[PDB]
Coordinates of C-alpha atoms and ligand atoms in Angstrom, one line a residue:
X103 CA 117.9 100.2 69.0
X104 CA 115.1 102.0 70.9
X105 CA 114.6 103.1 74.5
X106 CA 117.0 101.5 77.1
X107 CA 115.7 100.9 80.6
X108 CA 118.8 102.6 82.0
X109 CA 118.1 105.7 79.9
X110 CA 118.4 108.7 82.2
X111 CA 114.9 110.1 81.4
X112 CA 113.2 106.7 82.0
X113 CA 115.1 106.3 85.3
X114 CA 114.3 109.8 86.5
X115 CA 110.7 110.0 85.2
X116 CA 109.2 106.7 84.2
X117 CA 105.8 108.2 84.3
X118 CA 106.5 110.6 81.5
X119 CA 109.0 108.3 79.7
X120 CA 107.0 105.1 79.5
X121 CA 103.8 107.2 79.1
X122 CA 105.5 108.5 75.9
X123 CA 106.0 105.0 74.5
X124 CA 102.5 104.1 75.7
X125 CA 101.0 106.9 73.5
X126 CA 103.3 106.2 70.6
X127 CA 102.0 102.6 70.4
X128 CA 101.0 99.5 72.3
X129 CA 104.2 97.6 71.4
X130 CA 107.6 99.3 71.0
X131 CA 111.0 97.7 70.6
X132 CA 113.7 98.6 73.1
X133 CA 116.4 97.3 75.5
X134 CA 116.3 95.6 78.9
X135 CA 118.7 96.8 81.6
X136 CA 121.0 94.1 80.0
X137 CA 121.0 95.8 76.6
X138 CA 118.9 92.6 75.8
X139 CA 116.2 93.4 73.2
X140 CA 112.7 93.6 74.6
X141 CA 109.2 94.6 73.5
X142 CA 107.7 97.3 75.8
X143 CA 104.0 96.8 76.4
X144 CA 102.6 99.7 78.2
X145 CA 98.8 100.1 78.1
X146 CA 96.3 98.9 80.7
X147 CA 94.4 96.3 78.5
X148 CA 97.4 94.9 76.7
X149 CA 99.4 94.5 80.0
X150 CA 96.5 92.4 81.5
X151 CA 96.0 90.5 78.3
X152 CA 99.7 89.5 78.2
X153 CA 99.6 88.5 81.9
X154 CA 96.6 86.3 81.3
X155 CA 98.2 84.6 78.2
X156 CA 99.7 81.1 78.7
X157 CA 101.8 81.7 75.6
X158 CA 103.9 84.1 77.7
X159 CA 106.2 82.4 80.3
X160 CA 108.8 83.5 82.8
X161 CA 111.5 81.1 81.7
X162 CA 113.9 82.7 79.2
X163 CA 114.7 81.2 75.8
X164 CA 129.4 82.0 91.2
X165 CA 127.3 79.7 93.4
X166 CA 127.7 76.0 94.1
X167 CA 125.7 73.1 92.5
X168 CA 123.6 71.7 95.4
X169 CA 122.5 75.2 96.4
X170 CA 121.4 76.3 92.9
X171 CA 117.9 74.7 93.3
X172 CA 117.1 77.2 96.1
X173 CA 117.4 80.1 93.6
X174 CA 116.1 78.5 90.4
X175 CA 113.1 77.2 92.3
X176 CA 111.5 80.5 93.2
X177 CA 107.7 80.7 92.4
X178 CA 108.1 83.8 90.3
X179 CA 110.5 81.9 88.1
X180 CA 108.1 79.0 87.8
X181 CA 105.9 78.2 84.8
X182 CA 103.0 75.7 84.4
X183 CA 103.0 72.9 84.8
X184 CA 105.1 73.4 88.0
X185 CA 103.7 76.8 89.1
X186 CA 100.1 75.8 89.9
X187 CA 101.1 73.3 92.6
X188 CA 103.6 75.6 94.2
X189 CA 101.0 78.4 94.1
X190 CA 98.3 76.2 95.6
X191 CA 100.5 75.1 98.5
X192 CA 101.8 78.5 99.6
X193 CA 98.3 80.2 99.1
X194 CA 96.7 77.4 101.2
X195 CA 99.3 78.2 103.9
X196 CA 98.4 81.9 103.7
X197 CA 94.7 81.1 103.9
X198 CA 95.1 78.9 107.0
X199 CA 97.3 81.7 108.6
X200 CA 94.4 84.3 108.3
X201 CA 96.3 87.3 107.1
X202 CA 93.7 89.8 108.2
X203 CA 93.9 88.5 111.8
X204 CA 97.5 89.9 111.7
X205 CA 96.3 93.6 111.8
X206 CA 96.6 94.1 115.6
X207 CA 100.1 92.7 115.6
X208 CA 101.0 95.1 112.7
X209 CA 99.6 98.0 114.7
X210 CA 101.7 97.0 117.7
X211 CA 104.8 97.0 115.6
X212 CA 104.0 100.3 114.0
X213 CA 103.1 101.9 117.4
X214 CA 106.3 100.7 118.9
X215 CA 108.3 102.0 116.0
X216 CA 106.5 105.4 116.1
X217 CA 107.1 105.9 119.8
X218 CA 110.9 105.5 119.2
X219 CA 110.9 108.0 116.3
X220 CA 111.7 111.2 118.2
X221 CA 114.8 109.5 119.5
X222 CA 116.1 109.0 116.0
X223 CA 116.1 112.6 114.9
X224 CA 119.3 114.1 113.6
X225 CA 120.8 117.4 114.6
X226 CA 118.4 119.4 112.4
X227 CA 115.5 117.8 114.3
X228 CA 114.4 115.8 111.2
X229 CA 113.9 112.1 111.1
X230 CA 114.2 109.6 108.2
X231 CA 110.9 107.7 107.9
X232 CA 112.4 105.1 105.7
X233 CA 115.2 103.9 108.0
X234 CA 113.4 104.2 111.3
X235 CA 109.8 103.3 110.4
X236 CA 109.0 101.8 106.9
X237 CA 112.0 99.4 106.7
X238 CA 111.8 98.1 110.3
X239 CA 108.1 97.6 110.0
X240 CA 108.2 95.7 106.8
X241 CA 111.0 93.3 107.8
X242 CA 109.5 92.8 111.3
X243 CA 106.0 91.9 109.7
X244 CA 107.6 89.4 107.3
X245 CA 109.8 87.8 109.9
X246 CA 106.9 87.5 112.4
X247 CA 104.6 86.3 109.6
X248 CA 107.0 83.4 108.9
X249 CA 107.8 82.8 112.6
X250 CA 111.5 83.9 112.7
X251 CA 112.5 84.6 116.3
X252 CA 112.9 88.3 117.1
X253 CA 116.6 87.8 118.1
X254 CA 117.2 86.9 114.4
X255 CA 115.7 90.0 113.0
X256 CA 119.0 91.6 112.3
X257 CA 120.5 88.5 110.7
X258 CA 117.6 88.3 108.3
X259 CA 117.9 92.0 107.5
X260 CA 121.5 91.3 106.5
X261 CA 120.5 88.1 104.7
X262 CA 117.8 90.0 102.8
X263 CA 120.5 92.4 101.7
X264 CA 122.7 89.6 100.7
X265 CA 120.0 88.2 98.6
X266 CA 119.3 91.4 96.7
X267 CA 123.0 92.3 96.0
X268 CA 124.1 88.6 95.2
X269 CA 127.8 89.4 95.5
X270 CA 129.6 86.0 95.4
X271 CA 132.3 87.0 97.9
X272 CA 129.4 87.5 100.3
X273 CA 127.0 84.8 99.3
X274 CA 129.4 81.9 99.1
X275 CA 129.3 82.2 102.9
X276 CA 125.9 83.5 103.9
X277 CA 123.8 81.6 101.4
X278 CA 124.7 78.2 102.8
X279 CA 124.4 79.7 106.3
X280 CA 120.9 81.0 105.7
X281 CA 119.7 77.8 104.0
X282 CA 120.9 75.7 106.9
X283 CA 119.3 78.2 109.3
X284 CA 116.0 77.6 107.5
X285 CA 116.2 73.8 107.4
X286 CA 116.8 73.8 111.1
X287 CA 113.9 76.1 111.8
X288 CA 111.7 73.8 109.7
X289 CA 112.8 70.7 111.7
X290 CA 112.2 72.7 114.9
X291 CA 108.7 73.7 113.9
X292 CA 107.9 70.2 112.6
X293 CA 108.7 68.7 116.0
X294 CA 106.5 71.4 117.6
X295 CA 104.1 73.2 115.3
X296 CA 102.8 76.7 116.1
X297 CA 100.5 79.1 114.4
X298 CA 103.1 80.9 112.3
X299 CA 103.3 80.7 108.5
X300 CA 106.2 78.2 108.5
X301 CA 104.0 75.8 110.4
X302 CA 101.2 76.3 107.9
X303 CA 103.7 75.8 105.1
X304 CA 104.7 72.5 106.7
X305 CA 101.1 71.5 107.3
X306 CA 99.7 72.6 103.9
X307 CA 98.4 69.9 101.5
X308 CA 97.5 69.7 97.9
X309 CA 94.2 68.1 97.1
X310 CA 95.9 64.8 96.3
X311 CA 97.7 64.8 99.6
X312 CA 101.0 66.2 98.2
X313 CA 103.2 68.5 100.4
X314 CA 106.0 71.0 99.9
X315 CA 109.5 69.5 100.2
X316 CA 111.8 71.1 102.8
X317 CA 113.9 72.6 99.9
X318 CA 110.7 74.1 98.5
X319 CA 109.8 75.5 102.0
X320 CA 113.2 77.0 102.4
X321 CA 113.0 78.5 98.9
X322 CA 109.6 79.9 99.8
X323 CA 111.0 81.6 102.9
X324 CA 113.8 83.2 101.0
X325 CA 111.3 84.3 98.3
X326 CA 108.9 85.9 100.8
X327 CA 111.6 88.0 102.5
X328 CA 113.0 89.0 99.1
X329 CA 109.7 89.8 97.6
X330 CA 108.1 91.6 100.5
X331 CA 110.8 93.5 102.4
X332 CA 111.7 96.5 100.2
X333 CA 108.5 96.7 98.1
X334 CA 106.4 97.2 101.2
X335 CA 108.7 99.7 102.8
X336 CA 108.6 101.9 99.7
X337 CA 104.9 101.7 99.4
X338 CA 104.8 103.3 102.9
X339 CA 107.5 105.8 102.0
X340 CA 106.1 106.7 98.6
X341 CA 102.6 106.9 100.0
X342 CA 103.6 109.1 102.9
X343 CA 105.5 111.4 100.5
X344 CA 102.5 111.4 98.2
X345 CA 100.1 112.5 101.0
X346 CA 102.4 115.2 102.4
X347 CA 103.0 116.8 99.0
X348 CA 99.2 116.8 98.5
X349 CA 98.2 118.2 101.9
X350 CA 94.5 118.1 101.3
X351 CA 94.7 114.3 100.9
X352 CA 96.6 114.1 104.2
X353 CA 94.0 116.3 105.8
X354 CA 91.2 114.3 104.3
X355 CA 92.6 111.1 105.8
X356 CA 93.2 112.6 109.2
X357 CA 89.6 113.7 109.3
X358 CA 88.2 110.4 107.7
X359 CA 90.5 107.5 108.5
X360 CA 87.8 105.2 107.3
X361 CA 88.9 106.3 103.8
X362 CA 92.2 104.5 104.2
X363 CA 91.3 101.3 102.3
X364 CA 90.2 103.2 99.3
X365 CA 93.1 105.6 99.7
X366 CA 95.6 102.7 99.7
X367 CA 94.2 101.5 96.3
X368 CA 95.0 105.0 94.8
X369 CA 98.4 105.1 96.4
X370 CA 99.2 101.7 94.8
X371 CA 98.1 103.0 91.5
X372 CA 99.8 106.4 91.7
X373 CA 103.1 105.6 93.5
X374 CA 103.4 101.8 94.0
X375 CA 107.0 100.8 94.4
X376 CA 107.1 98.3 91.5
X377 CA 106.9 99.7 88.0
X378 CA 107.6 96.6 85.8
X379 CA 106.7 92.9 85.7
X380 CA 109.3 90.2 85.5
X381 CA 110.3 89.5 81.8
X382 CA 107.9 87.4 79.8
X383 CA 108.8 85.2 76.8
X384 CA 106.7 84.1 73.9
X385 CA 106.5 80.3 73.5
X386 CA 105.5 80.6 69.8
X387 CA 105.2 83.3 67.1
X388 CA 102.1 85.4 67.8
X389 CA 100.4 88.7 67.2
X390 CA 100.3 91.1 70.1
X391 CA 98.2 94.3 69.6
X392 CA 99.2 94.3 66.0
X393 CA 102.9 93.4 66.3
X394 CA 104.5 90.1 65.3
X395 CA 106.2 88.6 68.3
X396 CA 108.7 85.8 67.6
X397 CA 109.0 82.7 69.7
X398 CA 111.7 83.4 72.3
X399 CA 111.2 87.1 72.2
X400 CA 111.3 88.9 75.5
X401 CA 108.4 91.2 76.5
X402 CA 108.8 93.8 79.3
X403 CA 105.4 94.7 80.7
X404 CA 105.3 98.2 82.2
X405 CA 103.0 98.5 85.1
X406 CA 103.4 102.2 85.8
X407 CA 102.4 103.3 82.4
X408 CA 99.3 101.0 82.6
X409 CA 98.4 102.5 85.9
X410 CA 98.5 105.9 84.3
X411 CA 96.7 104.9 81.1
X412 CA 94.1 107.6 80.0
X413 CA 92.3 104.8 78.1
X414 CA 91.3 103.3 81.5
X415 CA 91.5 106.2 84.0
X416 CA 90.0 109.7 84.1
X417 CA 92.8 112.3 84.6
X418 CA 95.3 109.5 85.6
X419 CA 98.0 112.0 86.5
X420 CA 96.0 113.4 89.4
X421 CA 96.4 111.9 92.9
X422 CA 92.9 111.4 94.2
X423 CA 92.4 109.1 97.1
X424 CA 88.6 109.2 96.6
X425 CA 89.0 107.8 93.0
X426 CA 88.4 104.2 94.0
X427 CA 84.8 103.6 95.2
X428 CA 83.6 101.9 98.3
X429 CA 83.3 98.1 97.5
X430 CA 84.8 98.5 94.0
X431 CA 86.9 95.6 92.8
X432 CA 90.6 96.2 92.6
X433 CA 91.3 98.3 89.5
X434 CA 95.1 98.7 88.9
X435 CA 98.0 96.4 88.0
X436 CA 100.5 97.5 90.7
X437 CA 100.3 93.9 92.0
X438 CA 100.3 92.3 88.6
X439 CA 97.6 90.2 87.1
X440 CA 96.9 86.5 86.4
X441 CA 98.6 83.5 87.9
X442 CA 101.7 85.4 89.1
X443 CA 99.6 88.1 90.8
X444 CA 101.4 89.2 94.0
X445 CA 100.6 86.6 96.6
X446 CA 101.7 89.1 99.3
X447 CA 99.1 91.7 98.1
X448 CA 96.7 91.3 101.1
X449 CA 99.6 91.6 103.5
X450 CA 101.0 94.6 101.7
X451 CA 97.6 96.4 101.6
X452 CA 97.2 95.7 105.3
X453 CA 100.7 96.9 106.1
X454 CA 100.3 100.2 104.2
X455 CA 96.8 100.8 105.7
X456 CA 98.1 100.2 109.2
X457 CA 101.3 102.2 108.8
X458 CA 99.4 105.2 107.5
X459 CA 96.7 104.9 110.1
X460 CA 99.1 104.9 113.0
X461 CA 101.3 107.6 111.4
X462 CA 98.2 109.8 110.9
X463 CA 97.0 109.4 114.5
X464 CA 100.4 109.7 116.2
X465 CA 101.8 112.6 114.2
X466 CA 98.8 114.5 112.9
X467 CA 101.0 117.5 112.1
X468 CA 103.8 115.6 110.4
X469 CA 105.6 117.8 107.8
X470 CA 108.2 117.5 105.1
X471 CA 111.6 118.7 106.1
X472 CA 112.2 121.7 103.9
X473 CA 112.6 120.2 100.4
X474 CA 111.0 118.5 97.4
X475 CA 111.1 114.9 98.6
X476 CA 112.0 113.9 95.0
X477 CA 115.6 115.0 95.6
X478 CA 116.0 111.7 97.3
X479 CA 114.4 109.6 94.5
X480 CA 116.6 106.7 93.5
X481 CA 117.3 106.1 89.8
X482 CA 116.2 102.5 89.5
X483 CA 115.0 100.7 86.3
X484 CA 111.5 99.4 87.0
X485 CA 111.5 100.3 90.7
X486 CA 110.3 103.5 92.4
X487 CA 112.0 104.2 95.8
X488 CA 113.3 107.0 98.0
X489 CA 116.7 106.9 99.5
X490 CA 115.2 108.7 102.5
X491 CA 112.2 110.8 103.5
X492 CA 113.2 113.4 106.1
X493 CA 110.3 114.6 108.2
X494 CA 109.5 116.9 111.1
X495 CA 107.3 115.1 113.6
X496 CA 105.8 118.2 115.3
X497 CA 105.6 121.9 114.6
Ligands
LIG545 C1 103.5 97.0 98.3 C2 104.3 95.9 98.2 C3 104.3 95.0 96.9 C4 104.2 95.3 95.6 C5 104.1 96.6 94.9 C6 104.3 94.0 95.0 C7 104.3 93.7 93.6 C8 104.3 92.5 93.0 C9 104.0 92.3 91.6 C10 103.8 93.4 90.6 C11 104.1 91.0 91.4 C12 103.9 90.3 90.0 C13 105.2 90.2 89.2 C14 105.1 89.5 87.8 O1 104.0 89.0 87.5 O2 106.1 89.5 87.1 C15 104.4 90.3 92.6 C16 104.5 89.0 92.8 C17 104.8 88.4 94.0 N1 104.9 89.0 95.2 FE1 104.6 90.9 95.6 N2 104.4 93.0 95.9 C18 104.4 93.6 97.1 C19 104.5 93.0 98.4 C20 104.7 91.6 98.6 C21 104.8 91.0 99.9 C22 104.7 91.7 101.3 C23 105.1 89.7 99.6 C24 105.3 88.5 100.6 C25 104.6 88.4 101.7 C26 105.1 89.5 98.2 C27 105.3 88.3 97.6 C28 105.2 88.0 96.2 C29 105.5 86.8 95.5 C30 105.9 85.5 96.2 C31 105.2 87.0 94.2 C32 105.4 85.9 93.0 C33 104.0 85.2 92.8 C34 104.0 84.1 91.8 O3 104.9 84.1 90.9 O4 103.1 83.3 91.7 N3 104.9 90.7 97.6 N4 104.5 91.3 93.6

C-alpha cells in the first residue's frame, strides 16, 4: 500500500519523511490524500524532468452547471493545447503591469500594517504576525494588483476562504455572487481602463489578435486570489520564523539588507509554503527513473524533498542565506518548473523581500514569544504553514 500523504509522520515532518522515500529510491508507490494510488517522485533531477515532460498532464484519467466552467477552467488545471494560449494572455498582462514597479506600493502596505502592530498585542504583550501582518499584506497586494476597491477587501478575504473550503452550503450562495461581482468589475474597467491588472487582462492580446473571454478573465481573478493569498502569507511567516530561530541569519540581514534577494531564494528552498506539485498523469506507458509507469497513473511530485536533495545541494539541511550567489540563476523547485511554473513568483519574491525588509527595519529587536514556533505548525499534506507566530516587538 505504501506511504499515505495523511500519514502522521509525513504531516509532522515532511522533510524527514519524504527525504526517507527520496533516499530509498527515485520512484516509490504510495497513496494520495484520497487513498488514491500515486507514484512519489522526490529527487531534484527527476522532479524537474517530470515537470518538463509533455507526457505528464494535469487532467486526471454540489455546484450548478453554468458555473462549472469557472472552476474547471483554471490555468493550473489546463493542459496543452489549451494551456499555452491562456498562459500567454495572463503573462502578457503581468508584463504590461510591470510587477517590479509595485515595490513602493508593497512597502507602503507593509509599513502601514507594521505601524498598527503594537495595537494588536494580546494581554501577554505578544502579537501574532500571521493574522496582523502576513495575511493582511498578501491579500491587500493581490487585491490591489487586480484593481479590487479597498472597500471590498473584506469581501474578497471571505470569498478567498469560501474558495479554499468549497462547502456547498456556503458556495451555492457566494460563488454566483463573486462571479457576478467580477463580471461587473470587468464591464466597469472596460468602459474606463486604468493601470491595474484587470485592465491589462482586458487589453491583453495574443499574437493572432485573440483575447481572453470575460469568463476566462473572471476565472483568472479567482485563480490569482486562490493561488497567491495563503502561499505568500506563509512564505512570510515561515521565513520570519526561520530567521528568528537562526538568530545569526536575522542579525546578518539587519546588518546587510542588500542580502535580502539572495536570502529570499534560500528561504524559498528551506521553508517555502508549498511542498508538492499538483498531481501529474502519464498519457502513455513510460519508464521513469527505472520504474514502469502505466498510462493513466498518477504521479505526486514532492518539491520539499527535491529542495533538500543532497544530490544537488551541499548540506541541504542547513539554513544558509548566503548559499545562493549574487546573480546566480534560480536554483530550487519551490515555485515549480516548466510550463506551469508559478506565474506569481516575481510578485511573491517581491512580497517576501519587502515584508522582511520593513520588518527588519521597523522591529530590529523582534523576538519569538517564549516557545518553539513549531508548536503552531499545522499538519497539512503538501503544505507548510503556521497557525500563528507569536512575537515580541520590543525588549
Ligand atoms: C510564496 C508564494 C508562492 C508559492 C510557494 C507558489 C508556488 C507555486 C507552485 C509550486 C506552482 C506550480 C504547481 C504545479 O506545477 O503543479 C505554482 C503555480 C501557480 N502560481 Fe504560485 N506560488 C506562490 C505565490 C503565487 C502568487 C502570489 C500568485 C498570483 C499572483 C500565484 C499564482 C500561480 C498560478 C496562477 C499558478 C499556475 C500556473 C500555471 O498552471 O500555468 N502564486 N505556484
